[PDB]
């Protein structure tokens, strides 16, 4: 497993933030950009809680970005037993993030969109869930 | 015999007089613990 | 949890383990 | 020219009474009264006395208190049934009101061969006050059609109730008499008396 790309993202966050530390503290230009970076990472879900730039130096990690992966997200939500099963469901097109079907396992769910990841309406997997509960309603076609 | 819990206070005239004195003192000094716009 | 837990889910799991211990 | 959509006689494993099939043909109140011939004689009351949607039973469970004028869309029979249940002891008992209205329609048909729904429409139309008074002494003013319908229903139901409150007559019979008299326009009905009194007082202060 290669985390080359995420290391570059983590590194680029470190190099960028360091340059802000160099720029004089009272400058409004740096303060605005530092907050935008923190807001962006918070929106992405990398930072679970609003953090300071000094915290952003060390909280950002490859594992944090891996946690936002859709198959990893599904595993915690218990939609899939194991990551490999989650990837297979994504490839076969049984999962939707909001109104959009995502067939790319590499997709990272944002913080707001985390709540709306679910099975597609006509998935045979979804029918298996409702049949197990005996709650399958054919008016909803699922 | 002992009692398990604090007795419920009785609001007599003196208790009122002490309370209103504190209120008047607070108003006179304009010392209000009220929320303000930030 | 192949990739671990965030700070919030670590706190939640610890709380559940405590109550189960009780 | 012929149009045919059914090539086989329909026979169900569950027996269905033939009356229910004649109801399949057309929707009728209690499967006994047709809405087709019913018409509101007064032009103004039209669009507020709603009879165009036939209903089998008054119970509808519609949402008519949400907006200001949804009551106008409510079927008039359901409005009468709803008005029938008041006075605390009868609050919330809609099935009893439905039965009372069914029996009242039966009585109206027996006494007068006319369609009972037409009798109800005529009563509500006749007993609506076209002019009222407002306190300043008093000053005369006009009355909106919705208020006319509301007050007509209230007057008819209240008169029928008060007539049989402590009398041998039952609610169904007294309501039938009230409706027949109001449709006739005769002064015997309590609602017609009240309407005439209000309009006279308004004319005095006109």
């Amino acid at each position: 497993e290669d985390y080359h790309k995420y290391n570059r993202i983590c590194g680029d966050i470190r190099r960028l933030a360091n340059k802000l530390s160099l720029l004089p503290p009272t400058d409004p230009f740096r303060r605005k950009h530092e907050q935008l970076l923190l807001d962006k990472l918070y929106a992405m879900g990398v930072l679970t809680t609003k953090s300071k730039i000094s915290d952003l130096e060390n909280k950002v990690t490859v594992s944090a970005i891996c946690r936002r992966r859709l198959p990893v997200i599904m595993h915690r939500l218990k939609m899939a037993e194991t990551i490999q099963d989650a990837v297979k469901f994504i490839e076969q097109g049984h999962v939707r993030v909001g109104p959009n079907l995502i067939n790319d396992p590499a997709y990272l769910v944002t913080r707001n969109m985390e709540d709306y990841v679910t099975w597609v309406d006509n998935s045979k997997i979804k029918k298996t869930l409702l049949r197990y509960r005996n709650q399958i309603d054919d008016f909803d076609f699922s | 015999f002992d009692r398990t819990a604090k007795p419920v206070p009785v609001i007599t005239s003196e208790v009122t007089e002490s309370l209103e004195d504190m209120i008047r003192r607070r108003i006179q000094d304009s010392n209000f613990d009220d929320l303000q716009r930030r | 949890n192949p990739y671990g837990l965030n700070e919030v889910d670590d706190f939640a799991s610890k709380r559940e383990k405590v109550l189960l211990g009780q | 020219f012929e149009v045919v959509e059914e090539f086989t006689p329909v026979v169900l494993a569950t027996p269905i009474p033939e009356e229910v099939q004649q109801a399949q043909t057309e929707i009728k109140l209690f499967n006994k009264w047709s809405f087709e011939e019913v018409e509101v004689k007064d032009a103004s009351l039209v669009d507020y006395v709603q009879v165009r949607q036939p209903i089998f039973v008054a119970h509808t469970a519609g949402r008519y208190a949400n907006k200001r004028f949804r009551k106008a869309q409510c079927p008039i029979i359901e409005r009468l049934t709803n008005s029938l249940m008041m006075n605390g002891r009868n609050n919330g008992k809609k099935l009893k009101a439905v039965r009372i209205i069914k029996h009242t329609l039966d009585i109206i048909n027996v006494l007068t061969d006319q369609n009972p729904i037409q009798v109800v429409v005529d009563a509500i139309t006749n007993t609506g006050p076209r002019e009222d008074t407002t306190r300043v002494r008093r000053q005369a003013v006009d009355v909106s059609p919705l208020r006319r319908v509301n007050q007509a229903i209230a007057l008819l139901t209240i008169g029928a109730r008060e007539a049989a409150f402590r009398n041998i007559k039952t609610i169904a019979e007294t309501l039938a008499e009230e409706l027949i008299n109001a449709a006739k326009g005769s002064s015997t009905s309590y609602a017609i008396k009240k309407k005439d009194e209000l309009e006279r007082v308004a004319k005095s202060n006109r």
């Binding site: 709540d115 | 604090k6 108003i27 209000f32 930030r38 | 919030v8 | -």
Partner: protein
């Protein structure tokens, strides 16, 4: 939607835990729930009662509504508590006030702060309503001045914050209405006066109502949640209860 509420509760509990640690190390500002909206957005309050209230409780609920400038009275006929709070959360309500009674005598008052708590429960003593005053007249409904007296302990600060945010921020300097919460041995006396500045002092006139409220529970969650972790609870059967002070 249910997933969002579940996730936010875990964040809310985690935030309170971290804040508690931060307070402890400082021992060795406004609360997190109120920090976001403190001094920006005025409170939105719904005042309700228990099922089938007596007439006196309805009158008392009306008086509590007049107490808070942005309160609205809602009838609780058949409303289910999870449905009640869910409806309030949809409508943007900030706080919910539920009143209980015993034979038309108010006994309890519970305040729930949305979206995640806390919920504070009070018991009312020596309640005197304004309906008990003849020829009282109407109230003044200006944004009132607030007085919080004798709140010292950290719990006392917590109670002040919950009560402070029920009113609108930024009363006029010359507003003649003052609402006072005076803590006297954990029994918070609530009075409402209208004052006139005289040339040699101040004169105040009581409007009412009078009632003493004593906190006995404070939970980290909305009032629907009987499983919410308890931040603080009143111990009654401990041997020091008859003389222990908390606020």
């Amino acid at each position: 939607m249910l997933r969002r509420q579940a996730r936010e509760r875990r964040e809310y509990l985690y935030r309170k835990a971290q804040e508690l640690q931060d307070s402890q190390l400082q021992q060795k500002q406004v609360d997190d729930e109120y920090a976001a909206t403190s001094g920006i957005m005025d409170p939105r309050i719904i005042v309700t009662t228990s099922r089938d209230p007596s007439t006196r409780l309805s009158q008392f609920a009306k008086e509590i509504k007049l107490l808070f400038p942005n309160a609205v009275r809602l009838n609780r006929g058949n409303y289910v508590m999870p449905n009640l709070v869910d409806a309030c959360k949809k409508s943007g309500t900030t706080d919910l006030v539920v009143l209980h009674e015993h034979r038309g005598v108010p006994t309890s008052l519970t305040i729930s702060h949305f979206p995640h708590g806390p919920t504070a429960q009070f018991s009312l003593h020596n309640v005197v309503m304004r309906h008990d005053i003849i020829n009282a007249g109407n109230q003044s409904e200006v944004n009132p001045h607030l007085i919080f007296d004798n709140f010292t302990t950290a719990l006392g600060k917590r109670v002040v914050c919950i009560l402070k945010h029920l009113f609108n921020a930024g009363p006029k300097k010359d507003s003649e209405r003052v609402i006072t919460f005076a803590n006297r041995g954990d029994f918070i006396s609530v009075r409402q006066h209208v004052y006139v500045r005289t040339r040699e002092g101040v004169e105040i006139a009581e409007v009412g109502p009078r009632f003493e409220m004593r906190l006995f529970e404070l939970r980290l969650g909305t009032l629907e949640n009987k499983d919410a972790d308890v931040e603080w609870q009143l111990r009654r059967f401990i041997r020091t209860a008859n003389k222990k002070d908390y606020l």
